[PDB]
Amino acid sequence: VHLTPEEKSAVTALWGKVNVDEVGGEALGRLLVVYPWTQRFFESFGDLSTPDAVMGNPKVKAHGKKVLGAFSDGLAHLDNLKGTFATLSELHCDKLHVDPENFRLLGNVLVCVLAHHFGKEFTPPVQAAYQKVVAGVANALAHKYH
Amino acid sequence: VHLTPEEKSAVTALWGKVNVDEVGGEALGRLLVVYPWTQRFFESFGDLSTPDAVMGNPKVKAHGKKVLGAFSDGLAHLDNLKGTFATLSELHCDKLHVDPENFRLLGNVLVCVLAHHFGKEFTPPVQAAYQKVVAGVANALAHKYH
Amino acid sequence: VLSPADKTNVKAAWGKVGAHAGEYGAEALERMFLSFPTTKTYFPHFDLSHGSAQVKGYGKKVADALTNAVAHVDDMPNALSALSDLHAHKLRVDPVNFKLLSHCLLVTLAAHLPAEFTPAVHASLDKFLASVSTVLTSKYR
Amino acid sequence: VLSPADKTNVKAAWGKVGAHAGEYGAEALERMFLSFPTTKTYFPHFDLSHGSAQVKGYGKKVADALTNAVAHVDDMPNALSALSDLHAHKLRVDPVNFKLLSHCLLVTLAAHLPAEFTPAVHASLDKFLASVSTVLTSKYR
Ligand code: HEM
Ligand code: HEM
Ligand code: HEM
Ligand code: HEM
């Protein structure tokens, strides 16, 4: 994926307002609630059996912060997502055994979280730019699978 | 998409044995039988009311031959499927209004036809190479949509 | 299957949408056409510009069908039977596109329902839209 | 839904699989692992090399489940109830992978049973495998 200069500007402007301590835990929690089969990868988190248990789980929050920090790193290298994420792609394949289809689900939920948090500011053109971003990140994270 | 040199050799060898007069019409016919909603694009083709009518339809056979000839062009330019299919991509988007998801359906039907035609020779590694080919053709045909 | 909690959550969220249902349908379509341009292949006969009368009119039809489904959440196959016939025999949209529209409907609801779009409600709405989509593709072959 | 003709076609085609069911299941899995390497993420505890004992044994399990589904084509949700429980609550394979395995089963049948794999039978088998997949993901959420 490649973004036009206007899309890059819109992505970067919105992201500068994203709360680093919160959006990641919200997105990861919603992934686990909306698509509960994804809980298979997170047994060590403990009880994930209700929305309240997931959303308040401190390990969900801490892990989501790391996931979104890596996402933030990708936004600093939008022309080189595959290179930027190659080590993490290898990790998710070789060590974590994560089906990359899950990366697309997390992108779905992240877009919903941005829309929920920002409201009307998350316009249809801003969403379209973020859809390119989350697709690019998912594709980059899938790239070193074999 | 990137085939290994071994995969390129295997796809080229098998394709040289393909009956260019039948395989395209068989793949297109099976698309219309197995996924009958795809008949929407071919109302001008006449009788599509039964499997026998579809497979025996002279317009299905003639058009399938043209589709297969385009596939052959892709197999001759595996390192530049994007450029090979750019004009047909624009045509399928702007003139024909064909959802590119149909290209993926046709590609997997073509793989089934190759398996049917070649039997034991269509080994699991040969299939894996052809899966790269049909995904690459579908991606290239989708690339100029907008 | 939609659980009792799913049905409660969907009815509550759609009740909050209220008179905006048609507007949100049109916005979800605009989001879908912009984010997923291949979906435009089904509307070569539409002006797809922002605010077009055809997108507004069609978005109201989508919204009304969803309202019908909410009002008949216990037996959606029967309530949507005529619409599923039309999808299977005439419109013939590839099934993947229903996931794209469903996602854009969720984004639209999220952008307009700050209090209501909780994780639980998000999950229930996703299941509901997938169930509608399943009904609408159930007669394809 | 599977029509009476679909059920006839599936029973005839799968009946010809016969005692090869296990071998053909292992071949379909090999085809899937080579063609769609992301599916291997579900089998880190397996030796996935050509001819491995674990792939052969698992292929027999898949094939035997399909034979049972064919024998109970009139009430598949009930016949597969314990297996769908296991998929929803433990295995938790993302739904996309079922289409990949189904495609590789069709390829395997086409390569082995050319006289059976007519266009109509191909259509019926694809519907049947999609129906099995639907049952196996029916309890996910
Ligand atoms: C944009 C998408 C994603 C990004 C950027 C991302 C990033 C990360 C990062 C930075 C780590 C920590 C690596 C380390 O500590 O060395 C990690 C670990 C992990 N990720 Fe991902 N991830 C993504 C999606 C997913 C998804 C969708 C799943 C599963 C559904 C997943 C499953 C895991 C697991 C299981 C771990 C290890 C956690 C643990 O040790 O308990 N990841 N990821
Ligand atoms: C996936 C590989 C495909 C290839 C390589 C391909 C190639 C072609 C070619 C070479 C033509 C004729 C162009 C011309 O005469 O100028 C054509 C026309 C057409 N294609 Fe495709 N096609 C593919 C898939 C599809 C699919 C899956 C559909 C619909 C389900 C489709 C719908 C059409 C239609 C409706 C026409 C015009 C037919 C007519 O003139 O009546 N194509 N395609
Ligand atoms: C939740 C999913 C959907 C619902 C509830 C829905 C509902 C409707 C309704 C109520 C109509 C009008 C039916 C009539 O005239 O009696 C319609 C028409 C139509 N639908 Fe949608 N639909 C859905 C998804 C889709 C998708 C995903 C596409 C393609 C991307 C699509 C494409 C069309 C088209 C092309 C028409 C004909 C519009 C016209 O010519 O005016 N639908 N749908
Ligand atoms: C037609 C579709 C499928 C059928 C009929 C099927 C059948 C089965 C059966 C009968 C079992 C053993 C159940 C038991 O222990 O009681 C099983 C286990 C399993 N299935 Fe499949 N399955 C299907 C699709 C898939 C797919 C698409 C995947 C992933 C790509 C998958 C991954 C697994 C895994 C990882 C196990 C556990 C194997 C082990 O640990 O030994 N299944 N399945």
Ligand 1 center from residue D134 Cα (angstroms): 28
Answer whether C22's CB lies under 8 Å from C60's CB: yes
- Closest residue by Cα to atom 33, ligand 3, is C91
The reply, when asked if residue A97 is annotated as ligand binding, is no
Answer whether D86's CB lies under 8 Å from D24's CB: no
Instruction: For C93, list phi and psi in degrees, rounded to 5.
Output: -70, 135
Ligand 2 center from residue B92 Cα (angstroms): 7
Query: At A111, is the secondary structure helix, strand, or coil?
Result: helix
What is Dmax (Cα atoms) for chain B? Answer: 44
Query: At A42, is the secondary structure helix, strand, or coil?
Result: coil
Answer whether A51's CB lies under 8 Å from C119's CB: yes
Answer whether D125's CB lies under 8 Å from D106's CB: yes
Contacts of A115 in chain C (CB under 8 A): 107-108, 110-111
Please give the residue range of the domain that contains residue D32. 1-141
- Alpha helix positions (H), B16-100: 23-34, 51-56, 58-75, 81-84, 86-90
D71-77: long-range contacts, CB 8 A cutoff, minimum separation 24: D73/D2, D73/D7, D73/D10, D73/D11, D73/D128, D74/D7, D76/D131, D76/D132, D76/D135, D77/D135, D77/D138
Give CA torsion, residues A130, A135, A137, A138, to 10 deg: 140
Give the 3-state secondary structure of A113-125. Answer: HHHHHHHHHCCHH
D92: left (phi over 0), alpha (psi -120 to 50) or beta: left
| Nearest C-alpha neighbor of B124 from the set D49, A145, D14 | D49
Determine the Cα–Cα distance for residues D6 and C88; give it in Å rounded to an integer: 18
Give the 3-state secondary structure of B113-141. Answer: HHHHHHHHHCCHHHHHHHHHHHHHHHHHH
The reply, when asked if residue A59 is annotated as ligand binding, is no
Determine the Cα–Cα distance for residues B19 and B22; give it in Å rounded to an integer: 6
Ligand 4 center from residue D90 Cα (angstroms): 10
Total count of residues recorded for chain C: 141
Q: How far is CA C68 from the centre of its chain?
A: 11
Instruction: For C26, list phi and psi in degrees, rounded to 5.
Output: -65, -40
Determine the Cα–Cα distance for residues A41 and A61; give it in Å rounded to an integer: 15
Answer whether D132's CB lies under 8 Å from D14's CB: no
Determine the Cα–Cα distance for residues B39 and B46; give it in Å rounded to an integer: 10
B50: left (phi over 0), alpha (psi -120 to 50) or beta: beta
Torsion sign across C-alpha atoms C75, C12, C62, C36 = negative
Q: Which residues of B are annotated as a binding site for heme b?
A: 63, 92
Minimum-distance CB partner of D37 among A34, A102, A146: A146
| Nearest C-alpha neighbor of B29 from the set B18, B20, B38, B17 | B38
Answer whether B103's CB lies under 8 Å from B137's CB: yes
- CB of B137 within 6 A of ligand 2: the answer is yes
Going from N- to C-terminal start, the domains of chain A cover 1-146
- CB of B13 within 6 A of ligand 2: the answer is no
Rounded alpha-carbon distances, angstroms, from residue A119 to A36, A79, A80, A106, C36: 26, 28, 30, 19, 21
Determine the Cα–Cα distance for residues A12 and D113; give it in Å rounded to an integer: 56
Determine the Cα–Cα distance for residues D33 and B57; give it in Å rounded to an integer: 37
Structure tokens at A40: 């298979």
- CB of B35 within 6 A of ligand 2: the answer is no
Answer whether C141's CB lies under 8 Å from D127's CB: yes
For residue A29, give the H/E element and its range.
Answer: helix A23-34
Determine the Cα–Cα distance for residues B128 and A41; give it in Å rounded to an integer: 28
Instruction: Please count the other Cβ atoms lying within 10 Å of the Cβ belonging to residue C138.
Output: 15
C123 and D141 in contact by Cβ < 8 A?
yes
Determine the Cα–Cα distance for residues B66 and B68; give it in Å rounded to an integer: 5
CB-side exposure of A77: number of CA atoms within 13 Å?
13
Cα Rg of chain A, angstroms? 15
Determine the Cα–Cα distance for residues D14 and D97; give it in Å rounded to an integer: 22
Query: At B21, is the secondary structure helix, strand, or coil?
Result: coil
Answer whether D138's CB lies under 8 Å from C131's CB: no
Instruction: Please count the other Cβ atoms lying within 10 Å of the Cβ belonging to residue A72.
Output: 14
Pocket test for ligand 3, best of C93, C109, C125, C138 (most atoms within 8 A of CB): C93
- Closest residue by Cα to atom 9, ligand 1, is A67
- CB of D43 within 6 A of ligand 4: the answer is yes
Determine the Cα–Cα distance for residues D138 and D141; give it in Å rounded to an integer: 8
- CB of B89 within 6 A of ligand 2: the answer is no
Cα B29–Cα B128–Cα A94 angle in degrees, nearest 5: 140
Nearest ligand by distance to the CA of D87: 4
Answer whether B97's CB lies under 8 Å from C44's CB: yes
A46: left (phi over 0), alpha (psi -120 to 50) or beta: left
Q: Is B95 exposed, middle or buried (0-12, 13-18, 19+ CB in 10 A)?
A: exposed
Give the 3-state secondary structure of chain C. Answer: CCCHHHHHHHHHHHHHHHHHHHHHHHHHHHHHHHHCHHHHHHCCCCCCCCCCHHHHHHHHHHHHHHHHHHHCHHHHHHHCHHHHHHHHHHHCCCCHHHHHHHHHHHHHHHHHCCCCCCHHHHHHHHHHHHHHHHHHCCCCC
Cα D121–Cα D20–Cα B18 angle in degrees, nearest 5: 55
For residue A65, give the H/E element and its range.
Answer: helix A58-75
| Nearest C-alpha neighbor of A81 from the set A125, A132, A123 | A132
C92: left (phi over 0), alpha (psi -120 to 50) or beta: left
**Angle of the D21-35 helix axis to the D53-71 helix axis, nearest 10:** 120
Q: Which of residues 112-131 of D touch B (CB under 8 A)?
A: 112, 114, 117-120, 122-123, 126
Rounded alpha-carbon distances, angstroms, from residue D33 to B114, B125, C43, D91, D132: 19, 10, 38, 17, 20
Answer whether C105's CB lies under 8 Å from C129's CB: yes
A55-58: long-range contacts, CB 8 A cutoff, minimum separation 24: A55/A26, A55/A29, A55/C119, A57/A29
Contacts of C141 in chain D (CB under 8 A): 123, 127
Instruction: Please count the other Cβ atoms lying within 10 Å of the Cβ belonging to residue C104.
Output: 26
Instruction: Please count the other Cβ atoms lying within 10 Å of the Cβ belonging to residue C18.
Output: 8
Cα D107–Cα D112–Cα D113 angle in degrees, nearest 5: 100
Resolution as reported, in Å: 1.3
Determine the Cα–Cα distance for residues D14 and C20; give it in Å rounded to an integer: 52
| Chains contacting A (3 or more CB pairs within 8 Å) | C, D
Total count of residues recorded for chain B: 146
Q: Which residues contact C82 (CB under 8 A, 6 or more apart)?
A: none
- Alpha helix positions (H), chain D: 4-17, 21-35, 53-71, 76-79, 81-86, 96-112, 119-136
**Angle of the B23-34 helix axis to the D119-136 helix axis, nearest 10:** 50
Q: Which residues contact C113 (CB under 8 A, 6 or more apart)?
A: A116, C13, C16, C17, C121
Ligand 1 center from residue B132 Cα (angstroms): 28
Answer whether D59's CB lies under 8 Å from D67's CB: no
Q: How far is CA C74 from the centre of its chain?
A: 17
- CB of D107 within 6 A of ligand 4: the answer is no
Q: Is C33 exposed, middle or buried (0-12, 13-18, 19+ CB in 10 A)?
A: buried
Structure tokens at C76: 């959606």
User: How many structural domains is chain D composed of?
Assistant: 1
Q: How far is C86 from chain A (nearest CA, A)?
A: 29
Ligand 3 center from residue A132 Cα (angstroms): 25
Q: Do chains A and B touch (3 or more CB pairs under 8 A)?
A: no
Determine the Cα–Cα distance for residues B82 and B143; give it in Å rounded to an integer: 7
Cα A130–Cα A136–Cα A138 angle in degrees, nearest 5: 105
A36: left (phi over 0), alpha (psi -120 to 50) or beta: alpha
Determine the Cα–Cα distance for residues C122 and C107; give it in Å rounded to an integer: 10
Answer whether D29's CB lies under 8 Å from D104's CB: yes
Residues lining ligand 3, CB < 6 A?
C 39, 42-43, 58, 61-62, 65-66, 83, 86, 91, 93, 97-98, 101, 132-133, 136
| Chains contacting C (3 or more CB pairs within 8 Å) | A, B, D
Structure tokens at A131: 């859809």
Determine the Cα–Cα distance for residues A78 and A115; give it in Å rounded to an integer: 21
Determine the Cα–Cα distance for residues A99 and A112; give it in Å rounded to an integer: 21
